[PDB]
């Protein structure tokens, strides 16, 4: 029901450390806990995290356990020390999602009506994605399609927590991920922007190729509805450059 979620640069590393510290004896690869935060203006944010040991079996994905009394006591303590913080969702590692997620969501949604799922890639750092958000929508797959689970991804963007800039600057103090050295820094900005564009659009081309081969189920009912407009949007007409031959070339020549 939420319009979008925004992840803080405040819980990602906490989740990763929780994975690391509870993975010493639990090698299930499956770390499951709850992400706490606040939802105010159709923008959901996460401010705290907690991990619980969690074991799975591949048999129908219905074998598991948690410490709900301890987790509830944690939530009471967190709300006592900070009332505005509330459980905004529950998180599971292992981006290859299994089938127990529906049972976990059903059990934990008593804490949050719009129960959401969060996947944190502790080891993977594919391009820049720290985590992904998931919204539970089972209200009919589509107008003329059969029933399905259909956990969709609510759009997520990394937020800007306050007072953490001092700490992150002191922590790194080596890369200086700022616009320093404007010309070279923007060159690097163009470089990885092209890298990201090429990688993602190649992924889209691969998806179109695999849909053409038909080895995977085809979710065309949203794929063409979202990509047809993308393809047909007329950014290829050059007569507007003809109308704007001095688009900025006057500013180019004054700068020269």
């Amino acid at each position: 029901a939420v319009q979008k979620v925004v992840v803080h640069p405040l819980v990602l590393l906490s989740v990763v450390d929780h994975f690391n510290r509870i993975g010493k004896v639990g090698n299930q690869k499956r770390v499951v806990g709850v992400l706490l935060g606040s939802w105010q203006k159709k923008v959901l944010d996460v401010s705290n995290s907690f991990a619980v040991p969690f074991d799975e079996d591949d048999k129908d994905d219905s074998v598991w356990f948690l410490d709900h009394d301890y987790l509830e006591n944690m939530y009471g303590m967190f709300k006592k020390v900070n009332a505005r913080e509330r459980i905004v969702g529950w998180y599971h590692t292992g981006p290859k999602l299994h089938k127990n997620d529906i049972a976990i969501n059903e059990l934990m949604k008593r804490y949050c009506p719009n129960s959401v799922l969060v996947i944190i890639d502790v080891k993977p750092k594919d391009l820049g994605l720290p985590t992904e958000a998931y919204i539970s929508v089972e209200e009919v797959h589509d107008d003329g399609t059969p029933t399905s689970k259909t956990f969709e991804h609510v759009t997520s963007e990394i937020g800007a927590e306050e007072a953490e800039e001092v700490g992150v600057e002191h922590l790194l103090r080596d890369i200086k991920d700022t616009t320093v050295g404007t010309l070279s820094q923007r060159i690097t900005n163009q470089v990885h922007g092209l890298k990201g564009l090429n990688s993602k659009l190649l992924d889209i081309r691969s998806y179109l190729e695999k849909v053409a081969t038909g080895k995977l189920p085809i979710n065309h009912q949203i794929i063409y509805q979202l990509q047809d407009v993308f393809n047909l949007l007329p950014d290829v007409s050059l007569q507007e450059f003809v109308k704007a031959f001095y688009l900025k070339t006057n500013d180019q020549m004054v700068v020269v």
């Binding site: 092209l194 090429n198 007409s237």
Partner: protein, 373 residues
Amino acid sequence: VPGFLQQSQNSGPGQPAVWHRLEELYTKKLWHQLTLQVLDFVQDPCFAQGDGLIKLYENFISEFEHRVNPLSLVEIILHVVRQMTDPNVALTFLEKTREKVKSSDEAVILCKTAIGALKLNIGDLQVTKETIEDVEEMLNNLPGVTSVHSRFYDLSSKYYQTIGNHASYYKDALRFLGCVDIKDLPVSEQQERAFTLGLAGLLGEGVFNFGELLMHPVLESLRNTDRQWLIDTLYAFNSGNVERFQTLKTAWGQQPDLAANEAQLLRKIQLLCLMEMTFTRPANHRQLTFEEIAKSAKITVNEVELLVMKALSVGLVKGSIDEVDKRVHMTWVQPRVLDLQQIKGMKDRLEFWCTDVKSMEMLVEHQAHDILT
């Protein structure tokens, strides 16, 4: 109760075995398995001619056990309620079932659907519109029960033959086709359902995309053996193919519900014959001249103004419309099925964009080795 069991063991061959099961079930106080046995007996290969007698027996048993499964009991006894066939008392029967089971489960909403179905069958003015709307108004917090959803879809699909809903009637019929996947009923009747849905799309006005029914195999394979000209016409509406001869043969192929709206069929096919240019050419041919429009729609010059007007209104093309050169600018904001068998075209265009982007990235890298190396 023992006397009713003794009387009920008669009136059917093979029934006393089930009646013995019923006796065992209420001896050990079983209600769910009893509902399954009632389900088995009702769906036994018989017409249930003694509808009133079995109604009395079932109400007798349920009233002296008063712990049966509510939703499944109403799902079963609704067959007897419909079979009694007397609407003046059938309304009272549905009220009685509501009073016997007034829980917010499937029972009450199914009773509402039965009320609406009765109002269709006779008295199509009393509470028809309120009933059909209220079904969806009461399907709140019920995302995937899918049982009464299928029921509501069936009523509204049968409500297609009513002024209130035509395009929405087709939509919920598609919702029924999705929610219930297996055939579970004769192929000929599904083919008739596909015929009605096709006529619904042809007669409707807002159904320009009308997705999940154009090239849907579940709908087309029903009429794959009969009236394939209907399959071709829907494919024409999908891909923008004109086939004006075949589409006119479509117009007088199924005369009812099509002869009066063949003009609307003309306008819709003229509307939807331009989309093929629209997605195939990403502004590659952005000069939609009058001659090109004539080739695409086989339409006159004065009708171009109305056709492009309706195209802008619906959302097919939103670009500028000139008349000195008769050029129509190309923007589409209402995507539809792109013939996934022909996805090679958009894959090729996407890989063309990939090659261009990577080539220019390498070119600027070549120009920038003096800083990046």
